[PDB]
Swiss-Prot record, chains A, B:
Species this protein is from: Entacmaea quadricolor (Bubble-tip anemone)
Domain of life: Eukaryota
Lineage start: Eukaryota, Metazoa, Cnidaria, Anthozoa, Hexacorallia
Role played: Pigment protein.
Biotechnology note: Fluorescent proteins have become a useful and ubiquitous tool for making chimeric proteins, where they function as a fluorescent protein tag. Typically they tolerate N- and C-terminal fusion to a broad variety of proteins. They have been expressed in most known cell types and are used as a noninvasive fluorescent marker in living cells and organisms. They enable a wide range of applications where they have functioned as a cell lineage tracer, reporter of gene expression, or as a measure of protein-protein interactions.
UniProt protein name: Red fluorescent protein eqFP611
């Protein structure tokens, strides 16, 4: 199959946050069926960034989700054509981060192109003041909609002092493939845990890891529901 | 302890939806430590309601959450004083459901008083057209805030035709107890599965059941985090 037990990925991210232009590139690898992946990222233009790199974290890889309980895999099924994802993240303090991402497969390497736009981040907020300390894990809720797959997520960002900064997002994943055999998943969840393993040069070099698993609620049901 | 292996509860809910006044009463039983509970509800004023009972479901019981390790029980620790919860649920189609709830313990029985207000529910929406078919399970994300415990949830309501209606809410849980020995939990999740077991008389009688468990993310961590 096109998606092997071990896969490499390359990324280019370009955009702006509060009008500040920047560009990042990255390369990594992972085990798509295990739901694990690692990415080494460099800020190639605009570094050192005047905002917390944490806001870019979720924009740097859907092919690396372990699918349990027979939940159809929207992403792995999309190759060789690939897919796109579009998202809007709203922070509790006004900041909004919108992304349009394209995922392709070239010569056996996954290729990502993310176009990002961050707006209205408060000048004295943790993001613009670089007082963030990584994300907590989260649970995404998904279901078919708008000719694709819709996902909703709520996340908490650790901040200096021991508090948290909340944000939520809605995503629409769209397949570039037109296949009679394509199997669409139904309502389900994806547990995520994105952790920063390393960083250097005022966040101009960052190493991120993510573990993701598609699953159903583990609680028993009185009606025989998933 | 004040909260026993088996507990009963009594509830009174009064308020309005889109200007329509109603009142409900209920009594239930559960096992607080197992995280299970059942409530038998009757609409005593305004029935049959012109809106889907489903929108009231989450307003009818935090004492019934299973706890294993690492997460102190904000709710069970609050007795005998009890606690309150305040919440705002926003539906993707404009409807907003706001609640102020009081939880007390009288003569060994849990007593709930919920004051609710639903506004702007679209006339032709699933709620006002009574085309809803129960909630999917969900995962609530919690952390300390505003002198209490903050909770965020995202829920999907099944609707006639096989689709879903999305909503999300933010809650603030406040303990009525002042105790220097009170242990505040840190960041965690609560998995919920609320199901309707029975109903009759155009929803003038409803039996709901809920299973809830406080937990950390299931996924392993690369950094030894919880």
């Amino acid at each position: 199959s096109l998606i092997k037990e071990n896969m490499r990925m390359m990324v280019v991210m370009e955009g702006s946050v509060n009008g500040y232009q920047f560009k990042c590139t990255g390369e990594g690898d992972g085990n798509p069926y295990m739901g694990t992946q690692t990415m080494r990222i460099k800020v190639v233009e605009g570094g050192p960034l005047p905002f917390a790199f944490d806001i870019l974290a979720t924009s740097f890889s859907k092919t690396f989700i372990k699918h349990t309980k027979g939940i159809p895999d929207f992403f792995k099924q999309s190759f060789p054509e690939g897919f796109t994802w579009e998202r809007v993240t709203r922070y509790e303090d006004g900041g909004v981060f919108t992304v349009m991402q394209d995922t392709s497969l070239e010569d056996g390497c996954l290729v990502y192109h993310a176009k990002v736009t961050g707006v209205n981040f408060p000048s004295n907020g943790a993001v613009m003041q670089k007082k963030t300390k990584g994300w907590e894990p989260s649970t995404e809720m998904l279901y078919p909609a708008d000719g694709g797959l819709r996902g909703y997520c709520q996340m908490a960002l650790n901040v200096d002092g021991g508090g948290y900064l909340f944000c939520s997002f809605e995503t629409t994943y769209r397949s570039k493939k037109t296949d009679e055999n394509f199997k669409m998943p139904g309502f389900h969840f994806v547990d995520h845990r994105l952790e920063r393993l390393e960083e250097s040069d005022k966040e101009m070099f960052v190493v991120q890891h993510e573990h993701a698993v598609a699953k159903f609620c583990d609680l028993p049901s009185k009606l025989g529901r998933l």
